[PDB]
Amino acid sequence: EHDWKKCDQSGFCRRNRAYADHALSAISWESPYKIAPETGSFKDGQYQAIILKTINDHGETVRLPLTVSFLESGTARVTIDEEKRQKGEIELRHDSKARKERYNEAEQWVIVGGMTLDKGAKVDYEDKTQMTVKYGPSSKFEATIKFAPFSIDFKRDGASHIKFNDQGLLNIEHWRPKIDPPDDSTWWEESFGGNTDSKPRGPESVGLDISFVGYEHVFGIPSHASPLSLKQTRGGEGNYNEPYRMYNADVFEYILDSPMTLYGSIPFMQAHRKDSSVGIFWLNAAETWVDITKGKDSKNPLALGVKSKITTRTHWFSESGLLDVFVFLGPTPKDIISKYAELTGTTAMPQEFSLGYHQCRWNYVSDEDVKDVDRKMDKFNMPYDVIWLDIEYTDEKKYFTWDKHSFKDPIGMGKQLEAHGRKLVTIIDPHIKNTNNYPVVDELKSKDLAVKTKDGSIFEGWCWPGSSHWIDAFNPAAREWWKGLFKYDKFKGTMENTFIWNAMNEPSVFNGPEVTMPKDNLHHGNWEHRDVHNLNGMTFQNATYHALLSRKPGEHRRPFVLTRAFFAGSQRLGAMWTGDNTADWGYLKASIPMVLSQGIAGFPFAGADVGGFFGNPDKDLLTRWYQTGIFYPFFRAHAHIDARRREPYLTGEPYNTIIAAALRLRYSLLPSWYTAFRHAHLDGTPIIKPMFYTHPSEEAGLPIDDQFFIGNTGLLAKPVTDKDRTSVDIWIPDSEVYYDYFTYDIISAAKSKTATLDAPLEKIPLLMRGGHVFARRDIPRRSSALMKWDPYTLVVVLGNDRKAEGDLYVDDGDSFDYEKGQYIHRRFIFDANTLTSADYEGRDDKEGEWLKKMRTVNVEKIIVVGAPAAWKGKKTVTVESEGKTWAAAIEYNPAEKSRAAFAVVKKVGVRVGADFKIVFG
Ligand SMILES: OC[C@H]1O[C@H](O[C@@H]2[C@@H](O)[C@@H](O)O[C@H](CO)[C@H]2O)[C@H](O)[C@@H](O)[C@@H]1O
């Protein structure tokens, strides 16, 4: 039975909430923080200065240095530190060796670019009340710094969009000694969950109010079982009462519709309205809470006599470290997320197989179980790419071992899978069993690679194996060590098709407070665990990522690693999933806003356990779950140890047939999924896209989180996620023509609206937007690897303009050769009765081995949906490619009831890597 801190039980949460209550209550609250104007200098894209915080009635002050940066991107950055702790002029309690300064290495872990300062940014106006800086593209952005009381105001297009400290909630808890008097009851030791945090530094939280001016919707800060449009947190009907929490934790049977923390945290929030978008990124690795309220601008937000325009007020606070925030002014969603990704990284190029279907449970119990499941999937014509081994494969929960009784020949199991280009994934968690005759633990201790307690002893606690120690992946040497442990000749029973799953990396500690480590544990650098908690997961995933780059000499290849816990930047390192969900309809429905929130926070490679993890889903739920799951960028079935076997072939008819069809759709679209990952790699474009992203001009889109577009395809999905539903209402975003993917029925033309669509169990509700081209592979195979050289079908979807565009990206799916241009990237354009293929980047024609072999690979088929009538009774198209011209057969099919006119060209016979031109009509 799990115990979680509510705000009031977290000391620094209580104090910041109470500081907010006081400020909103008080008459003429002023933030007791001022820039000393004469400390101010602007140079070379950067203001620096000293804020003075007034700490008492007597006017005594402390010095907090302020750094405001204006980046070339047109992002700004605001940092506040504490001068006394920069200089070491404090004393820790208990003779702690913990670092005196404010944690300042989050940047190091997270930021990989976009830091170049804009020398074209400049002071427009100054005096000794305030200064305004102009920055970003042709100086369209303004920041007005106010000195007294400190505030910042971020503007563009003649208005404030984001304000810092307008409510006067700035709070840097300055260091103080523990002294009896000449409410401090949460300042020092705090007890929770069987543990007492010694709290050697005392109070050190950082907080700020950030207002989004004229914005009614905000989004991000995953992961939460919450809508995509975030709720208010200060009570009221359909609101929460607690702030949103980010404190990566192992939350057994986490509930729906809640601001409680889950397993990963990305403190990035965006605000969206019609044709305007902004956002912020709160770069802090400590426990972080976010309150959100919405109302009028007046101090009483329900007052009469004022403008009705809504502002969203947010109140951010973290336990320790710097106050460090980035500000994005957009003005589109695409802009914001694109800039965020320049800072924190784009999605890594994935292993192509990892977009396939993954089959998992706790546990497959032998190598015979695995090999039998493999054969059963082929027998029932259910394609999949990966079979997964959970923790029972180990020798008594020791990582880098196998149970010999149960897994006799892991190499042989390996090789059966390799017969179909399939892969094996095996779990490795960060806890190392504290036992005898275990070289891994000996090396961990002796090399000093383990996480430590508050007095420098090696931390010990309980997880799967019993007593355990934890690798300290913040330590570069622990990462270098770890890399060694995964070589094929070192990690026996693994081979080239073996990849890795990290869980329990929050870290999960069974006997620990909130199932994690004490706050006063110590890491490499002597940082407290409180400083770095939300980075821990990602440190561990990073270590594992780099271990898979090269596992034998001459190997250099893309890792695939699934993580449970994560942070900003984890997108560079692999996939995630939403942890231990439950086999129930509510969880299926909730999966979609969660997965969407992931990608709009820059970490799109995301999914939830298909079927739900806890319990036994009914057969219709499981079937629906496959129909949703084929639209997760990470698509894996998984099941708890007490759950019945539910490998998909066990479901029974008619469900087997329906689930097989879902799988085949996923596989057929694999070329378009892969292309969407490509874009995610190139500029952080989400893989599936909410309406607010694709249609920033459509106000009615803002709260919608149960449908989405796929990549660049124009495919609009809305899976059924309610019990016994046999139809679905799809919001049509705009006036373009939308076609049923299966029948080509015209659903809407001409007008935005809600359209009703037949949706029985056997139906996947999926629409094709006019204006788009996308590629698929129609030939069914048993895995993605066996699709590698099959021909493509292009679908050209036309509206009234009879124009479209789309794209296709391909490469070997495995190497870093894409970095030297070993790839095919096609842009397809439909215009004036002509489909053309050109290089996406406009490269001229040096061919490696994969590219050479692609010469045998063709577009063989083109389907045109919404074909124009003037094609009626024309029997050929003209095809040109690589100097050669020919005719190919086309059949035109006239419209018929609500079904569209379409046309089909078979046997196109043009190689996918070359320019081409096809003239219709
Ligand atoms: O490795 C086995 C599973 O571990 C994790 O799940 C846990 C869950 O199964 C349950 O037993 O409770 C503990 C404590 O909260 C959880 O950590 C993974 O999330 C799961 O995917 C694995 O199958």
| Cβ atoms < 10 Å from Cβ of 474 | 22
Is residue 514 in contact with ligand 1, taking CB distance under 6 Å?
A: no
Tell me the CA–centroid distance for residue 317 and ligand 1, in Å.
Answer: 30
Domain shared by 738 and 641, yes or no: no
- Matching residue, tokens 């320790």: 320
For CA atoms 785, 684, 672, 538, the dihedral sign is positive
Rounded Cα–Cα distance for residues 165 and 782 (Å)? 58
Q: How far is CA 160 from CA 143, 329, 696, in A?
A: 9, 10, 19
Tell me the CA–centroid distance for residue 428 and ligand 1, in Å.
Answer: 13
Is residue 223 in contact with ligand 1, taking CB distance under 6 Å?
A: no
Domain shared by 648 and 626, yes or no: yes
The pairing of strands 561-563 and 498-502 is parallel
Is residue 390 in contact with ligand 1, taking CB distance under 6 Å?
A: yes
What is the DSSP-derived secondary structure letter of residue 913?
T
Spatial contact of 633 and 604, defined as CB atoms under 8 Å apart: yes
Rounded Cα–Cα distance for residues 438 and 69 (Å)? 50
Is residue 886 in contact with ligand 1, taking CB distance under 6 Å?
A: no
Six-digit token pair at 235?
């009570």
Is residue 426 in contact with ligand 1, taking CB distance under 6 Å?
A: no
Tell me the CA–centroid distance for residue 703 and ligand 1, in Å.
Answer: 32
Residues with Cβ within 8 Å of 859's Cβ and at least 6 positions away in sequence, in order, are 791, 792, 793, 794, 837, 908, 910, 911, 912, 916
Q: Where are the beta strands (DSSP E) in 753-895?
A: 753-758, 766-769, 772-776, 792-797, 804-810, 824-831, 834-839, 858-865, 876-881, 884-893
Count how many Cα atoms sit within 13 Å of the Cα of residue 542 in the half-sphere of its side chain.
22
Can you give the resolution of this entry in Å?
2.4
Atom nearest to 564 CA in ligand 1: 19
Rounded Cα–Cα distance for residues 665 and 788 (Å)? 16
Rounded Cα–Cα distance for residues 593 and 706 (Å)? 7
Residues with Cβ within 8 Å of 420's Cβ and at least 6 positions away in sequence, in order, are 374, 378, 782, 783, 785, 786
H or E element, residue 295: strand 288-295
* Residues in a beta bridge with 291: 315
Six-digit token pair at 780?
């069914």
Is residue 394 in contact with ligand 1, taking CB distance under 6 Å?
A: no
Is residue 503 in contact with ligand 1, taking CB distance under 6 Å?
A: yes
Rounded Cα–Cα distance for residues 394 and 364 (Å)? 12
Six-digit token pair at 887?
């005719």
Domain shared by 256 and 275, yes or no: yes
Rounded Cα–Cα distance for residues 620 and 617 (Å)? 8
Is residue 463 in contact with ligand 1, taking CB distance under 6 Å?
A: no
Rounded Cα–Cα distance for residues 899 and 713 (Å)? 21
For 303-359, give the DSSP string: -SSS----EEEEEEEESSS-EEEEEE--SSHHHHHHHHHHHH-PPPPPPGGGGS-EE
Residues with Cβ within 8 Å of 267's Cβ and at least 6 positions away in sequence, in order, are 221, 246, 281, 282, 283, 284, 288, 290, 316, 568
Q: Which residue's alpha carbon is at the smallest distance from atom 12 of ligand 1? A: 252
CA 576 centroid distance within chain: 8
Which approach determined this entry? X-ray
Q: Which residue's alpha carbon is at the smallest distance from atom 18 of ligand 1? A: 503
List phi, psi (to 5°) of 853.
-70, -25
Q: Which of 263, 362, 510 to mutate to test the pocket of ligand 1 (most atoms within 8 A of CB)?
A: 362
Order of strands, edge to edge, in the sheet holding 466-470?
A: 431-433, 466-470, 461-463
Spatial contact of 537 and 524, defined as CB atoms under 8 Å apart: no
Atom nearest to 464 CA in ligand 1: 1
Rounded Cα–Cα distance for residues 351 and 354 (Å)? 5
Rounded Cα–Cα distance for residues 507 and 523 (Å)? 13
Q: What 3-state DSSP class applies to 851?
A: helix
Residues with Cβ within 8 Å of 541's Cβ and at least 6 positions away in sequence, in order, are 502, 505, 561, 563, 566, 570, 573, 574
Residues with Cβ within 8 Å of 745's Cβ and at least 6 positions away in sequence, in order, are 739, 898, 899, 900
Rounded Cα–Cα distance for residues 439 and 594 (Å)? 40
Tell me the CA–centroid distance for residue 771 and ligand 1, in Å.
Answer: 45
Domain shared by 50 and 79, yes or no: yes
Tell me the CA–centroid distance for residue 640 and ligand 1, in Å.
Answer: 8
Q: Which amino acid is present at 364?
A: Y
Spatial contact of 305 and 197, defined as CB atoms under 8 Å apart: no
Tell the burial category of 142 from Cβ atoms under 10 Å away from its Cβ (0-12, 13-18, 19+).
buried
HEC string for 3-64: CCCCHHHCHHHHHHHHHHHHHHHCCCCCCCEEECHHHCEECCCEEEEEEEEECCCCCCEEEE
H or E element, residue 667: helix 655-683
Tell me the CA–centroid distance for residue 365 and ligand 1, in Å.
Answer: 16
CA 693 centroid distance within chain: 15
Domain shared by 167 and 258, yes or no: yes
For CA atoms 694, 577, 424, 399, the dihedral sign is positive
Omega into 267 within 30° of 0, i.e. cis?
no
Domain shared by 247 and 389, yes or no: no
Q: Which residue's alpha carbon is at the smallest distance from atom 1 of ligand 1? A: 391
Tell me the CA–centroid distance for residue 369 and ligand 1, in Å.
Answer: 21
**Number of folded domains in the chain?**
4
Q: What is the dihedral of CA 676, 682, 686, 691, to 10 degrees?
A: -90
Rounded Cα–Cα distance for residues 296 and 401 (Å)? 61
Rounded Cα–Cα distance for residues 173 and 204 (Å)? 5
* Residues in a beta bridge with 625: none
Spatial contact of 435 and 463, defined as CB atoms under 8 Å apart: no
CA 806 centroid distance within chain: 24
Domain shared by 211 and 327, yes or no: yes
Domain shared by 162 and 186, yes or no: yes
Query: 261 is in which domain, residue-wise?
Result: 1-331
Is residue 262 in contact with ligand 1, taking CB distance under 6 Å?
A: no
Tell me the CA–centroid distance for residue 580 and ligand 1, in Å.
Answer: 7
Tell the burial category of 148 from Cβ atoms under 10 Å away from its Cβ (0-12, 13-18, 19+).
middle
End-to-end CA distance of the chain, in Å? 70
Rounded Cα–Cα distance for residues 779 and 791 (Å)? 8
Spatial contact of 739 and 774, defined as CB atoms under 8 Å apart: no
Among 331, 358, 387, the domain boundary falls at: 331
Among 720, 754, 770, the domain boundary falls at: 770
Six-digit token pair at 284?
């802090």
Spatial contact of 788 and 854, defined as CB atoms under 8 Å apart: no
Rounded Cα–Cα distance for residues 701 and 691 (Å)? 5
H or E element, residue 202: none
Domain shared by 323 and 339, yes or no: no
Q: Which amino acid is present at 268?
A: F
Q: What 3-state DSSP class applies to 824?
A: strand
Tell me the CA–centroid distance for residue 465 and ligand 1, in Å.
Answer: 13
Six-digit token pair at 241?
């009462």
Q: How far is CA 131 from CA 35, 37, 47, 147, in A?
A: 11, 10, 10, 8
Domain shared by 725 and 859, yes or no: no
Atom nearest to 391 CA in ligand 1: 1
Rounded Cα–Cα distance for residues 203 and 96 (Å)? 15
Atom nearest to 363 CA in ligand 1: 23
For 370-399, give the DSSP string: HHHHHHHHHHTT---SEEEE-GGGSBTTBT
Q: Which of 431, 562, 580 to mutate to test the pocket of ligand 1 (most atoms within 8 A of CB)?
A: 580
The pairing of strands 122-126 and 916-919 is unpaired
Omega into 868 within 30° of 0, i.e. cis?
no
- Matching residue, tokens 């001229």: 844
Atom nearest to 263 CA in ligand 1: 19
The pairing of strands 423-427 and 386-389 is parallel
Among 331, 361, 392, the domain boundary falls at: 331
Tell me the CA–centroid distance for residue 406 and ligand 1, in Å.
Answer: 21
Is residue 374 in contact with ligand 1, taking CB distance under 6 Å?
A: no
Rounded Cα–Cα distance for residues 288 and 286 (Å)? 6
Q: Which residue's alpha carbon is at the smallest distance from atom 15 of ligand 1? A: 252
Atom nearest to 579 CA in ligand 1: 19
Rounded Cα–Cα distance for residues 237 and 256 (Å)? 17
Domain shared by 361 and 251, yes or no: no
Residues in the chain: 921
Is residue 507 in contact with ligand 1, taking CB distance under 6 Å?
A: no
Q: What is the CA radius of gyration of the chain?
A: 28
Q: Which amino acid is present at 542?
A: N
Q: How far is CA 630 from CA 624, 636, 706, 727, 745, in A?
A: 10, 9, 15, 19, 22
- Matching residue, tokens 């074209």: 120
| Cβ atoms < 10 Å from Cβ of 185 | 8
Q: Which residue's alpha carbon is at the smallest distance from atom 23 of ligand 1? A: 362
Domain shared by 44 and 136, yes or no: yes
Spatial contact of 656 and 649, defined as CB atoms under 8 Å apart: yes
Q: How far is CA 348 from CA 58, 203, 574, 838, in A?
A: 55, 38, 7, 25
Is residue 579 in contact with ligand 1, taking CB distance under 6 Å?
A: yes
Percentages (nearest 5) of helix, strand, coil residues in the chain: 20, 30, 50
Residues with Cβ within 8 Å of 606's Cβ and at least 6 positions away in sequence, in order, are 575, 576, 577, 578, 594, 595, 598, 599, 632, 633, 634
Is residue 506 in contact with ligand 1, taking CB distance under 6 Å?
A: no
For 235-291, give the DSSP string: -STT--SS-EEE-----TTPPSS-----S----EEEEEETTEEEEEEE---S-EEEE
CA 846 centroid distance within chain: 35
Tell me the CA–centroid distance for residue 900 and ligand 1, in Å.
Answer: 49
